[PDB]
Amino acid sequence: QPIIQFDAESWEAEFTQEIQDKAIEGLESGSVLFFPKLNFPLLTEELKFLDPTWVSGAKNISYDPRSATLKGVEGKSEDLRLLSGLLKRYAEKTAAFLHLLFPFYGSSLKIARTSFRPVEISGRATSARKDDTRLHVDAFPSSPTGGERILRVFSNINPQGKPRSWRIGEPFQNYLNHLLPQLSPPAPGKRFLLYLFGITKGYRSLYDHYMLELHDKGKLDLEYQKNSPQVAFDFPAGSTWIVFTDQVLHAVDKGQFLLEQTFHLKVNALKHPEKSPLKLLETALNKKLVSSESFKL
Residue 208 identity (one-letter amino acid): D
272 is in an annotated binding site: no
Closer of 7 and 12 to Cl ion (Cβ): 7
**For the window 138-167, what string marks contact with Co ion as x by the rule CB under 5 A?**
x-----------------------------
Q: Which residues between 46 and 105 bind Co ion (CB under 5 A)? A: none
Among Co ion, Cl ion, none, residue 216 binds (CB under 5-8 Å by kind): none
Beta sheet of 164-168, edge-to-edge order = 231-235, 164-168, 250-254
Q: Taking CB under 5 A as the criterion, which residues in 112-141 touch Co ion? A: 138
As measured in angstroms, the least distance from the Cβ of 164 to Co ion is 13
The item of Cl ion, Co ion, none sharing an interface with residue 138, based on CB under 5 to 8 Å by kind, is Co ion
The C-alpha atoms of residue 145 and residue 243 are separated, in whole angstroms, by 16
Q: Which is nearer to Cl ion, 1 or 53 (CB)?
A: 1
Do the strands 250-254 and 3-5 form a parallel or antiparallel pair, or are they unpaired? unpaired
Q: Closer CB to Co ion, residue 42 or residue 176?
A: 176
> Between 131 and 293, whose beta carbon lies closer to Co ion?
131
Burial 272-294 (b: 16+ CB within 10 A, else e): eeebbbbbbbbeebeeebbeebe
Footprint (CB under 5 A) of Cl ion, residues 6-35: 6-7
Q: What is the DSSP string of 264-291?
A: EE-GGGSSSGGGSHHHHHHHHHTS---T
What is the rounded distance in angstroms from the CA atom of residue 245 to the CA atom of residue 150? 6
Contact residues for Co ion (CB under 5 A)?
138
- Residues flagged as binding site for Fe(3+): 136, 138, 250
